[PDB]
Design a protein around this ligand. Structure first.
Ligand SMILES: C[C@@]1(C(=O)NCc2ccccc2)CN(C2COC2)CCN1
Ligand SMILES: [Cl-]
Ligand SMILES: [Cl-]
Ligand SMILES: [Cl-]
Ligand SMILES: [Cl-]
Ligand SMILES: [Cl-]
Ligand SMILES: [Cl-]
Ligand SMILES: [Mg+2]
Length: 343
């Protein structure tokens, strides 16, 4: 057990191992974050103190979920866990959880500058490489958007902030909804990992044009922007929408054909246009997958099928389990004390 030291930073008490130095507050509903220098590894790191991690069954399960997911992710294009600690010496006094990751500077917003087509190729390639890994473990990110993509000086990219959002957060003219697939925006059906590919299409379009693809002022305005581009659904997709009310609403709209994407994305690489047509498909069954997209000719200069790894299997059976707060807390404690740091 390392030696811990205490200090008060912006009205909260932080108790952390001596290896973490020069703590400086950076941000704050799920917890507070400080930047620090890790004297053991030489990295600049982000230290997150969870706020009220075991206040309810829902909150305790969410704490366990986040720790399990972060401990599993080991990929160049996905955020990983450098450390996790608690100052508690036993389960009986266990109350606080701290998570440590590489400190990230800019996100794709702070670049979306002047992007060449070669820049778009490299950025989208890295997102898809990370997504092939995530999806191979049957994990769905569910919240991909430019603010959840970190980029460094050399245009190297990491996916962060997995979906672990409320009604107010998704209301109105808000970027929190502009990248969401329509079947999850409107609860049409049970969704799957194809929702993340819709988000990648929205992001790629924005990198090519400098503009949000579907900046709707509310759910219905956004749906109208989507259907004007990709066309209204045919009977085949309509059969798959489980809400009779949502089906009824869609059929009240006048039918529209899919637009010509070469006349929307004027002057773009024809191979980029082709890939966008394969991502932005209304029927999620028919979208290109991450593994298929990596083999698309648009990425010819970066694709290497010997260097696009998959994940170890991931057991999510806890998600259907019903437990008491203290049982979720004990499972979290075991995962804290069994953590093994990366090489
Ligand atoms: C895609 C779009 C755009 O940003 N167009 C500008 C552009 C800039 C560079 C290269 C090509 C195109 C167009 N609007 C209208 C709606 O249907 C076309 C929808 C969203 N933004
Ligand atoms: Cl230490
Ligand atoms: Cl990382
Ligand atoms: Cl504690
Ligand atoms: Cl964003
Ligand atoms: Cl019609
Ligand atoms: Cl597992
Ligand atoms: Mg975020």
């Amino acid at each position: 057990r390392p030696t811990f030291y205490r200090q008060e930073l912006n009205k909260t008490i932080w108790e952390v191992p001596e290896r973490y130095q020069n703590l400086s507050p950076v941000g704050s509903a799920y917890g507070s974050v400080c930047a620090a220098f890790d004297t053991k590894t030489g990295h600049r790191v982000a230290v997150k103190k969870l706020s009220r991690p075991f206040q309810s069954i829902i909150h305790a399960k969410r704490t366990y979920r986040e720790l399990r997911l972060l401990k599993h992710m080991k990929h160049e294009n996905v955020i990983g866990l450098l450390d996790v600690f608690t100052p508690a010496r036993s389960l009986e006094e266990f109350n606080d959880v701290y998570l440590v990751t590489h400190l990230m500077g800019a996100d794709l917003n702070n670049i979306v500058q002047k992007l060449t087509d070669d820049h778009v190729q490299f950025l989208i390639y890295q997102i898809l490489r990370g997504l092939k890994y995530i999806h191979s473990a049957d994990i769905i990110h569910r919240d991909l958007k430019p603010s959840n993509l970190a980029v460094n000086e050399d245009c190297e990219l990491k996916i962060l902030d997995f979906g672990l959002h409320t009604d107010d957060e998704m209301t109105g003219y808000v970027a929190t909804r502009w990248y969401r697939a329509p079947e999850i925006m409107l609860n049409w059906m049970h969704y799957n990992q194809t929702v993340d590919i819709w988000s990648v299409g929205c992001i790629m379009a924005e990198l090519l044009t400098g503009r949000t693809l579907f900046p709707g002022t509310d759910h219905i305005d956004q749906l109208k922007l989507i259907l004007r581009l990709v066309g209204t659904p045919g009977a085949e997709l309509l059969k798959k929408i489980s809400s009779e009310s949502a089906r009824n609403y869609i059929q009240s709209l006048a039918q529209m054909p899919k637009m010509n994407f070469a006349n929307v994305f004027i002057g773009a690489n024809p191979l980029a246009v082709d890939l966008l047509e394969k991502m932005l498909v209304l029927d999620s069954d028919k979208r290109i997958t991450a593994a298929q997209a990596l083999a698309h000719a648009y990425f010819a200069q970066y694709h290497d099928p010997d260097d696009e790894p998959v994940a170890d299997p991931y057991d999510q059976s806890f998600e259907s389990r019903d437990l008491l707060i203290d049982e979720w807390k004990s499972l979290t404690y075991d995962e804290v004390i069994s953590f093994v740091p990366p090489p």
